[PDB]
RNA sequence: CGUCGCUAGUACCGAUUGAAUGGCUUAGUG
């Protein structure tokens, strides 16, 4: 067959990933799914696009849906971009190189937040896997990681390499000592979940699920072993919804600290720290007011503490925007004015500039300098059509109608409309028809660039589907009104000719390429086929478990394929109304299934974001191509069949176009290494007068003892038995050095005693023959220290038991 | 005296003589101990006809309330906006 | 859910909840949305007539047919504030214990472990503290710390040492802890502590077994003087 | 967890026929068409069920004893007719039964009276049903007007269906032998259902059958009959004891029915009585 | 021996193991069943010649 | 000793002109 692949993707400015900003008023780099886009704020269009590679639909592309980049984080000085993907792989990028600088895969979940250190060597990585792994770009490895947090990493702050603060989704904030790799102290950031953190100077502010935002102080040199991060007060903000991101600004000349809090609702609420002598002036004033009120000195002091948070900071402005913001960034700083960039859930980027002087801003409301909507669509595409001439793509969603040229991938014409459900496009590229849920039928002409005629009362209910005859004279409408209505064009306006009653509402309408007959879907799970010339019922198609979502008619017109929410795609023979075969293609509901023109084969798209190619003759999936991260709402095929387009809830539009050591033996080796080492250490010291042990990070005597401890007991006696004498002499040297270290002896005395007795018993004749006078001293010394150790434990045992029974006797006498 | 189960619900005490309070265990050790328990428990004429009823597929059981259910005890077997949206 | 007839029904918490007085004398609180008895309040032994609520049910008064007036007052936030505070103390203690063990301040770690009831940390604090001692019983400060334990803490400690003693690999640690306590407390006082003697009962047999052991390991030791005296010849 | 559910609906606590001719006769008199689905009540071991399955497109067996259902299952397992048998276990008087053209039943005698009307009230009822009843209950169904056994049950069933005797079954034909004799009858439900209110027909039939051998006029002399009927007239006016007395007097006099006995009355006689009260505004039920 | 090959061959076609695993068309599975059954019957590993007498019998049933 | 599961709970993402309440407000009554 002929393989299919995805050539070029568009239609989305960026996904729900953080905004990354570079000055230029500024330029913003925001990513779309796996690819990265750069949008200049002044122009409103992208300067350039950064794409990883591995185009979707290619053989080398992985079957499973690709992971989008959740978090983009940049360092200007190195000119490098860190990309965090859903799977967990972190890819280092350079905007100039246009490729991946470095690939890091150590996180099992998506990366929550990121940070380049100023040096650029270390990149702090935070993931939802509850682990912070500090990644070294120049080292190409993770030097270490932090695991104490029990929930996802909502934020972290590391300006100084020495110390680190991290805040978790659970709500516990834990200061970290990096060199020791342990958390210094733990306090709850909030009773609820903590999602936002920000450190500046001594000041620490955190926001939780509740409205109130908590102010903290941290004294890095306190070293009190307690109260390292402490709260003075909590100030209640207006928005009950939390703040995902907190970023601050100060101007050194101004000496004023402004900041925003990016909330999960559209409004971003902002706050400003008051200037200290003004706070001092306010403190004096409030003391005055209290004296006129008559409060006592103790009362006067009390009110200062409660209002102390109010003394510190005040709101300079609350900025409100048209669309919900996924992320925001502090772009520009100036005492004269502030300018901010924010990326919206509706895929449009808004940028606001506000001037202020002294306490409050001059402008009562924020003003938007620029926007990015030319390439942006506010709502997901419900219905897509391909132009007959094949050089125009018609895109329809709520309150918007977009036409996209194939080569440019840029919107040539934008049309205002209603909640359009289905889109249809007449032959010759003159007109397009849109059907709204409100009941109105909207007709536009590309040359007019405006609506010709609207019939609000065409259908009282929603026009859930629409189709045209091959001649195009008759327009077939299927609506929730339970009646199929036929509209005939006249010269241009539409007039109603005939209506067909039906028992249920119409889900879809499909007119055959030959125009002989019309197929109708209904809610009762049944498909019906009517003769178009006579409007007489011809045959039904029964047995579907759930309603059919789409109906398509093959070019030969002998077979139709019904796609239904039951997740089974069924092909039906019209000549006699039989189902030739049924396939469970997708794990979720199948929206649309389209015959390839002049081919029995068909594409299919479903809620679970899987789009598949199926052969009519083989009746099996030709190719499984997975590109979207969300439900693929609709699919349209070119007249030639060269290219096919799909739309997903992500707002992205994709164009698809065809191209061994034995027990005891290890003890022998371990003994040689350590005894070689201890002989050296003694050898080196007398003169003054290996790699494995370093990795073990234990003493040469300690390393062997782990080996001895490692040996299983049942094989231990045989291990000693096979052991030659020359190594037994080494093993006696081992004990003496172990015996020198008193701490290790008592920890493992019982095991050492049994081994020594077995060896001496098993080599008593060999031992006695040896004439080494030094060997006397080794056996003598081990004896004296062994006796003290054994006697000590015995004396403690006999001491305890004797008094232990004494207690029993005394209790008996009392109760007896 | 013989070591038994933990008296406190929040602790695990093995026969080894070691007690394990749940709070101090790290997540990884919590997982294996759960798996360790799993292996321990894993190894640890009317009936003859009832399996025949469950063996057969073409048997429908009617309860007192009148509903039809299979032998296993499970019931043997729309909004326009939801289906299309 | 009411065992006897319900004679008063009044809404509280705005729409959210309804309180019902039953002829059993039982005042039941229900969630209107889910219709489930959240709480069952029993302050009367007789059947009820009057159920007056104030401040959206923050204050509830129920009168008994006997002539007893019983007043309930809302304390949900009060209870929630309490548990919140204890969690703050518990998390602080858990961290501080961890810091001390890394630092090696076994004495402070010892106190925290007993309060938090952490056996492994109680194992590690004593085990490696003994190791430092090996390099009166444990050390002057920790020995003093052992002296100050209250009756409840002593019983908790003795519950462990019993469980420690039975295993030969760990009896060594427990005995020294027993040694310190007998050496740093009035032995008379230890006997009055209820339940101590039954703990004392289990330690004795295992102590004797370990005493027969070790003595035997001692006994095998003059295999080495048999080596010395023999080759001296 | 089969025991979990089957034990929740049953506790797991009958005279079995041993005469092959009656089973052969019952199936033979059914005259089963090849394109008919049969509801079989009381399959028992399956001796009747297997024969029906041979000549039936489908057979739906309904059983009360989980013991006996399995023996049906074992008998038919791995057979060409296995696909054509569906066994419903449990009470079937409460469940809405499926479509069926013929009903062959070794019916439990306890549910004999409910069963006969469930078929009659079954929407689109079976065209013919071979039911096996006892002599006493069956003879009431077959009882004709003027006979000793003529009763309300006969009057009610006869107008919604025709019942005909097939054969007599002796108590020896079963073991352990029942204390009562047995019989087989054929019930043919009328299509279309005679358009008379189910309640009204019962209402008139009941008040006159309180004493079947007593005059109809006397049956309306009871004080409660006037009170229950008087309020029924108050219902007619909403959407007077002397008046309803007089109205009853005219009806029984004009129809010449006030001096005869319910035990000696035909369908037409009651229908005429049913009309004459409707004209004067009296509705029974 | 032969058992080990059976599990591996079945597993390669997806004939064994849990189906609801998170993180092949059925008819082709049936085709695999036929291939597995015929392949693991050496009598009908392969047997030496002359073991079976199917050809002699079938030729005769034709007669 | 591991990986993936199943159950309970906590929160998260956006679609279901999601639905239902209330605050203000356009316009029409009053």
* 3-state secondary structure string across A233-300: EEEECCCCCCEEEEEEEEECCCCEEEEEEEECCCCEEEEEECCHHHHHHHHHHHHHHHHHHCCCHHHH
**Does the beta-carbon distance from B24 to C118 stay under 8 Å?**
yes
Q: Do residues A125 and A111 make contact, with C-beta atoms less than 8 angstroms apart? A: yes
Q: Which of A478, A572, A549 is nearest to A518 (CA)?
A: A478
Q: Is A42 helix (H, G, I), strand (E, B) or coil?
A: coil
Structure tokens at A732: 């006696």
Instruction: Give the 3-state secondary structure percentages of chain A, helix then strand then coil, rounded to 5.
Output: 20, 45, 35
Q: What is the largest CA-CA distance in chain B?
A: 70
Least CB-CB distance to C120: which of B2, B3, B20?
B20
Distance CA A384, CA A645 (A): 8
**Chain B nearest-CA residue for D91:** B62
The 10 Å Cβ neighbour count of residue E37 is 10
Rounding to the nearest 10 degrees, give the CA dihedral for residues C41, C42, C43, C47: 110
Q: What are phi and psi of A179, to 5 degrees?
A: -65, -40
Hey, is D43 helix, strand or coil?
A: coil
Q: Which nucleotide is nearest to A345 (CA to C1')?
A: F14
Q: Do the beta carbons of residue A557 and residue A513 sit within 8 Å?
A: yes
Residue C48: which of C32, C31, C73, C28 has the closest Cα? C28
Q: Residue A639: how many CA atoms within 13 Å on its side-chain side?
A: 15
D165 labelled binding-site residue: no
Instruction: Give the closest of B27, B78, B80 to A480, CB-based.
Output: B80
Per-residue tokens: A95? 């905007």
Positions of strand F less than 7 angstroms from a protein CB: 1-6, 11-17
Closest CA to A721 of A793, A643, A668: A668
Strand, helix or coil for residue C4: coil
The partner residues of A39 in beta bridges, in order of sequence, read A28, A46
Beta bridge partners of A355: A337
Q: What is the largest CA-CA distance in chain A?
A: 127
Protein B10 CA to nucleic acid F7 C1', in Å?
A: 20
Structure tokens at D172: 């020896």
User: How many C-alpha atoms does A644 have within 13 Å on its Cβ side?
Assistant: 26
Q: Are strands A517-522 and A493-501 parallel, antiparallel or unpaired?
A: unpaired
| Distant-in-sequence, close-in-space partners of C38: CB < 8 Å, separation ≥ 6 | C17, C29, C30, C31
User: Quick check: A186 contacting C, CB < 8 Å?
Assistant: yes
Task: Give the pairing of strands A349-357 and A367-372.
Answer: antiparallel
Burial class (CB in 10 A: 0-12, 13-18, 19+), C172: buried
In contact, A703 and A744? CB cutoff 8 Å: no
Helix ranges (H only) for chain C are: 76-103, 106-116, 119-134, 140-147, 151-165, 171-183, 187-192, 196-219, 223-232
Burial label for A714, CB within 10 Å (0-12, 13-18, 19+), is exposed
Return the SS3 of C20: strand
CB contact under 8 A, D91 and B52: no
CB D19 within 8 A of CB D184: no
Chains D and C touch (3+ CB pairs under 8 A): no
Q: Rounded to whole angstroms, how far apart are CA atoms A805 and B70?
A: 68
At residue A321, the 3 state secondary structure works out as: coil
Beta carbon pairs, A and E, within 8 Å: 3
Give CA separation, A452 vs A303, A472, A478, A775, D82, in Å: 68, 17, 21, 113, 66
Choose among A815, A749, A814: nearest CA to A782.
Answer: A749
SS (H, E, C) A522-558: ECCCCEEEEECCCCCEEEEECCCCCCEEEEEECCCCC
Beta-sheet pairing, A256-263 with B19-21 = unpaired
Q: Integer distance in angstroms from CA A440 to C1' F29?
A: 30
Spatial CB neighbours of C229, under 8 Å, sequence gap ≥ 6: none
Asked if C163's CB is within 8 angstroms of B18's CB, the reply is: yes
Q: Which of A119, A127, A113 is nearest to A155 (CA)?
A: A113
For A329-362, b/e burial (b = at least 16 CB within 10 A) is bbbbeeeeebbbbbbbebbbbbbbbbebeeeebe
From residue A526, give the alpha-carbon distance in Å to each of A463, A482, A634, D52. 19, 14, 22, 34
- Tokens 């590391």 belong to A158
Contact D283, D232 (CB under 8 A): yes
**Coil, strand or helix: which one is C7?**
strand
Q: Are A29 and A79 in contact (CB under 8 A)?
A: no
Going from the C-alpha of C90 to that of each of A164, C116, C118, D285, the distances in angstroms are 23, 8, 13, 77
> C184 is written with which tokens?
């740093």
The residue of chain B with its CA nearest to that of C97 is B24
C1' of F20 to CA of A285 (Å) = 49
Contacts of A719 (CB under 8 A, 6+ apart): A663, A664, A665, A667, A711
Whether B84 sits inside 8 A of A464 (CB atoms) is yes
Q: Does D192 sit behind a cis peptide bond, omega within 30 degrees of 0 on the bond before it? A: yes
| D42 annotated to a ligand binding site | yes
CA dihedral A698, A700, A706, A708 (to 10 degrees): 180
In whole angstroms, give the CA distance from residue B59 to residue B49: 13
State the Cα–Cα distance between residues A197 and A173, nearest whole angstrom.
Answer: 9
In terms of Cα–Cα distance, which of A203, A165, A202, A205 is closest to A186? Answer: A165
Q: Residues A628, A679: contact at Cβ < 8 Å?
A: no
Q: Locate tokens 């428990």: which residue?
A: B41
Find residue A467's DSSP bridge partners: A476
Backbone angles phi, psi at C89, to 5 degrees: -65, -40
Nearest partner of D6 among B57, B54, B48, judged by Cα? B54
Q: Give rounded-to-5 percent helix, strand, coil for chain D.
A: 50, 20, 35
Percent helix, percent strand, percent coil in chain B, to nearest 5: 40, 15, 45
CA angle A442–A447–A450, rounded 5-degree value: 35
CB C110 within 8 A of CB C89: no
Tell which residue, D133, D103, D132, has the closest CA to residue D118.
Answer: D103
Residue D17 assigned as binding residue: yes
CA distance A443 to A487: 13
Distance A420 CA to F25 C1' (A): 29
Strands A653-658 and B11-13: unpaired
Footprint of strand F on the protein (CB under 7 A): A 16, 108, 169, 193, 209, 264, 324, 326, 345, 379-380, 398, 419, 437-438, 649; B 28, 31-32, 35-36, 39, 81-82, 85; E 18, 20-23
Q: In this structure, are residues A747 and C170 in contact, taking their beta carbons and an 8 Å threshold?
A: no
**Cα–Cα dist A557/A538, whole Å:** 14
B4 interface with A at CB cutoff 8 Å? no
* Determination technique for this entry: cryo-EM
Structure tokens at A692: 């494995």
Element containing residue A37 per DSSP (H, E): strand A35-40
Cα angle C178, B20, A742; round to 5: 50
- Measured distance CA(D5)–CA(D12) in Å, rounded: 12
Please, what sign has the CA dihedral across residues A746, A750, A751, A756? positive
Rounded CA gap, B52 and B39, in Å? 32
- Distance in Å from F8's C1' to B36's CA comes to 21
Calpha distance D145→D130 (Å, rounded): 23
Q: What is the DSSP letter of D13?
A: -
Q: How far apart are CA D46 and CA D54, in angstroms?
A: 12
Rounded distance between C-alpha atoms, residue A607 and residue A631, angstroms = 4
Burial (CB count within 10 angstroms: exposed 0-12, middle 13-18, buried 19+), residue A171: buried
Residues A479, A457: Cα–Cα separation, whole Å: 12
Cis geometry, peptide bond prior to residue D176 (ω within 30 degrees of 0): yes
Residue C169 makes CB contacts below 8 A (sequence gap 6+) with: none
At residue A764, what are phi and psi to the nearest 5 degrees?
A: -65, -45
What is the full DSSP assignment across D83-148?
A: GGEEEEES--SSS-----SEEEE---GGGHHHHHHHHHHSSS--SEEEEEEEHHHHHHHHPPTTST
């Amino acid at each position: 067959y002929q393989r299919f692949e995805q050539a070029a993707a568009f239609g989305v400015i960026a996904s729900n990933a953080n905004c990354v900003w570079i000055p230029a008023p500024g330029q913003l780099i925001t990513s779309a799914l796996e690819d990265v886009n750069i949008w200049d704020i002044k122009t409103g269009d992208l300067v350039s696009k950064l794409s990883d590679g591995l185009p979707p639909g290619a053989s080398d592309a992985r079957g499973a849906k690709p992971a989008e980049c959740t978090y983009l984080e940049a360092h200007k000085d190195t000119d490098l971009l860190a990309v965090g993907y859903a799977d967990g792989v972190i890819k280092v990028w350079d905007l100039m190189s246009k490729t991946v600088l470095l690939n890091f895969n150590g996180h099992k979940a998506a990366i929550t937040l990121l940070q380049f250190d100023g040096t650029g060597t270390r990149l702090i990585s935070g993931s939802k896997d509850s682990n912070i792994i500090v990644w070294d770009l120049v080292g190409e490895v993770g030097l270490y990681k932090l695991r104490s947090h029990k929930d996802s990493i909502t934020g972290f702050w590391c300006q100084g390499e020495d110390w680190l603060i991290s805040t978790s989704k659970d709500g516990m904030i834990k200061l970290w000592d990096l060199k020791t790799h342990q958390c210094i102290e733990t306090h709850i950031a909030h009773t609820g979940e903590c999602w936002g953190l920000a450190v500046k100077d001594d000041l620490l502010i955190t926001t939780g699920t509740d409205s109130q935002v908590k102010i903290w102080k941290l004294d890095i040199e306190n070293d009190k072993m307690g109260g390292k991060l402490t709260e003075m007060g909590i100030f209640e903000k207006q928005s009950k919804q939390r703040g995902l991101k907190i970023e601050f600004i100060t101007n050194s000349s101004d000496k004023t600290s402004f900041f925003y809090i990016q909330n999960a609702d559209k409004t971003i609420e902002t706050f400003r720290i008051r200037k200290e002598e003004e706070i001092a002036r306010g403190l004096k004033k409030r003391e005055k007011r209290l004296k006129e009120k008559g409060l006592t000195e103790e009362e006067i002091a009390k009110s200062i503490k409660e209002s102390y948070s109010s003394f510190i900071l005040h709101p300079f402005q609350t900025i409100r925007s048209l669309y919900k913001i996924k992320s925001a960034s502090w772009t520009t700083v100036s005492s004269s004015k502030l300018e901010l960039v924010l990326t919206t859930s509706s895929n449009t980027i808004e940028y606001y500039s506000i001037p202020y002087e002294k306490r409050d801003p001059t402008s009562p409301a924020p003003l938007k300098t620029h926007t990015i909507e030319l390439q942006g669509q506010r709502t997901d595409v419900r219905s897509i059509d391909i132009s007959d001439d094949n050089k125009l793509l018609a895109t329809a969603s709520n309150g918007s109608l977009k036409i996209w040229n194939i080569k440019t991938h840029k919107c040539i014409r934008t049309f205002e409309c209603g909640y359009a459900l289905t889109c249809k496009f007449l032959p010759g590229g003159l007109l397009v028809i849109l059907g709204t849920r409100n009941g109105e039928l909207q007709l536009f002409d590309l040359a007019s660039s405006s609506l010709l005629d609207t019939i609000e009362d065409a259908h009282d209910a929603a026009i859930w589907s629409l189709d045209l005859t091959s001649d195009g004279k008759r327009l077939v409408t299927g609506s929730a009104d339970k009646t199929v209505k036929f509209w005939d064009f006249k010269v241009l306006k539409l007039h109603h000719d005939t209506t067909l009653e039906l028992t249920d509402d119409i889900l879809c309408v499909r007119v055959s390429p030959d125009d002989r007959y019309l197929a109708i879907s209904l809610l009762d799970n049944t498909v019906k086929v009517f003769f178009l010339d006579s409007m007489k019922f011809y045959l039904s198609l029964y047995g579907h478990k759930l309603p059919v979502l789409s109906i398509d008619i093959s070019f030969d017109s002998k077979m139709i394929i019904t796609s239904s929410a039951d997740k089974n795609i069924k092909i039906w023979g019209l000549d006699f109304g039989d189902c030739h075969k049924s396939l469970f293609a997708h794990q979720d509901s199948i929206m649309n299934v389209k015959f390839l023109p002049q081919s029995h084969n068909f594409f299919s798209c479903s809620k679970d974001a899987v789009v598949k190619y199926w052969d009519g003759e083989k009746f099996e999936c030709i190719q499984k191509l997975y590109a979207h991260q969300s439900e693929v709402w609709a699919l349209a095929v070119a007249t030639d069949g060269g290219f096919v387009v799909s739309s997903s809830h992500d707002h992205s539009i994709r164009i698809w176009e065809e191209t061994s050591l034995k027990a005891g033996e290890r003890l022998m080796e371990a003994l040689d290494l350590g005894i070689a080492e201890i002989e050296g250490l003694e050898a080196y010291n007398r003169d003054m007068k290996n790699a494995v042990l370093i990795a073990v990070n234990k003493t040469p005597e300690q390393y062997i003892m782990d080996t001895l401890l490692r040996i299983r007991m049942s094989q231990l006696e045989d291990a000693l038995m096979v052991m030659p004498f020359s190594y037994v002499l080494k093993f006696l040297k081992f004990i003496d050095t172990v015996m020198q270290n008193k701490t290790l002896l008592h920890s493992h005395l019982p095991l050492i005693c049994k081994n020594l007795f077995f060896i001496i018993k098993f080599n008593h004749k060999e031992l006695v023959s040896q004439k080494n006078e030094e060997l006397k001293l080794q056996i003598n010394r081990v004896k004296t220290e062994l006796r003290s150790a054994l006697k000590s434990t015995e004396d403690d045992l006999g001491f305890n038991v004797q008094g232990l029974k004494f207690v029993k006797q005394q209790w008996n006498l009392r109760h007896n | 005296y013989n070591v038994g189960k933990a008296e406190k619900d929040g602790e695990i005490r093995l026969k080894n003589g070691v007690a394990m309070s749940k709070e101090e265990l790290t997540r990884e050790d919590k997982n294996r101990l759960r798996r360790a328990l799993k292996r321990k428990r894993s190894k640890a004429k009317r009936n003859d006809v009832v399996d025949t009823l469950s063996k057969a597929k073409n048997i429908t059981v009617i309860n007192q309330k009148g509903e039809k259910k299979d032998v296993s005890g499970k019931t043997k077997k729309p909004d326009s906006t939801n289906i299309k949206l | 859910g009411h065992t006897n007839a319900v004679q008063r029904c009044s809404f509280i918490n705005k729409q959210k909840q309804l309180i019902s007085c039953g002829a059993d004398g039982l005042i039941k609180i229900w969630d209107c949305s889910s219709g489930e008895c959240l709480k069952t309040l029993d302050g009367h032994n007789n059947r009820l007539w009057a159920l007056s609520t104030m401040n959206d049910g923050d204050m509830i008064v129920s009168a008994d047919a006997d002539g007893v007036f019983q007043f309930w007052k809302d304390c949900t936030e009060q209870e929630i504030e309490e548990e919140q505070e204890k969690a703050k103390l518990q998390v602080e203690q858990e961290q501080s214990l961890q810091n001390y063990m890394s630092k090696g301040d076994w004495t402070n770690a010892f106190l925290l472990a007993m309060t938090l009831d952490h056996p492994m940390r109680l194992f590690n604090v004593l085990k490696r503290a003994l190791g430092e001692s090996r390099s009166v019983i444990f050390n002057e400060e920790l020995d003093q710390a052992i002296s100050i334990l209250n009756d409840e803490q002593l019983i908790l400690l003795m519950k462990r040492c019993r469980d420690w003693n039975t295993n030969a690999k760990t009896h060594t640690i427990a005995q020294r802890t027993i040694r310190c306590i007998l050496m740093h407390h009035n032995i008379a006082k230890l006997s009055e502590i209820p339940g101590m003697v039954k703990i004392v009962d289990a330690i004795i047999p295992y102590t004797q077994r370990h005493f027969t052991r070790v003595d035997n390991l001692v006994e095998q030791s003059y295999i080495l003087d048999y080596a010395l005296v023999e080759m001296d010849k | 967890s089969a025991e979990k559910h089957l034990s929740s609906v049953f506790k797991f606590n009958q005279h079995i026929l041993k005469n092959p001719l009656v089973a052969q006769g019952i199936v033979d008199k059914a005259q089963i068409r090849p394109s008919d689905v049969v509801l079989e009540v009381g399959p028992g071991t399956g001796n009747l069920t297997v024969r029906i399955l041979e000549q039936a497109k489908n057979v739906v067996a309904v059983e009360m004893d989980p013991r006996m259902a399995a023996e049906l299952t074992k008998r038919v397992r791995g057979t060409p007719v296995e696909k054509k048998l569906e066994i419903m276990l449990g009470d079937f008087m409460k469940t809405e039964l499926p479509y069926f053209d013929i009903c062959i039943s070794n019916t439990p005698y306890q549910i004999s009276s409910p069963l006969v009307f469930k078929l009659i009230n079954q929407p689109r009822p079976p065209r013919v049903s071979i039911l096996m009843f006892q002599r006493e209950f069956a003879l009431r169904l077959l009882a004709r007007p003027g006979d000793s056994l003529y009763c309300r049950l006969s009057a009610n069933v006869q107008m919604w269906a025709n019942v005909t005797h097939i054969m007599k079954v002796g108590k020896n034909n079963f073991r352990p032998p029942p204390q009562v004799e047995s019989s087989v009858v054929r019930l043919e439900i009328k299509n279309p259902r005679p358009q008379v209110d189910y309640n009204e027909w019962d209402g008139l039939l009941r008040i006159v059958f309180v004493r079947k051998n007593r005059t109809i006029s006397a049956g309306f002399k009871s004080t409660t009959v006037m009170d229950i009927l008087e309020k029924n007239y108050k219902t007619f006016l909403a959407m007077m004891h002397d008046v309803v007395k007089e109205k009853i007097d005219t009806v029984l006099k004009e129809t010449d029915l006030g001096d005869k006995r319910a035990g000696k009355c035909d369908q037409n006689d009651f229908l005429r009585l049913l009309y004459a009260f409707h004209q004067v505004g009296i509705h029974f039920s | 021996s032969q058992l080990k090959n059976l599990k591996a061959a079945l597993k390669a076609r997806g004939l064994t193991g849990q189906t609801n695993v998170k993180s092949y068309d059925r008819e082709e599975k049936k085709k695999a069943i036929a291939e597995i059954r015929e392949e693991f019957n050496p009598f009908e590993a392969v047997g030496k010649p002359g073991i079976s007498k199917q050809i002699g019998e079938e030729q005769r049933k034709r007669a």
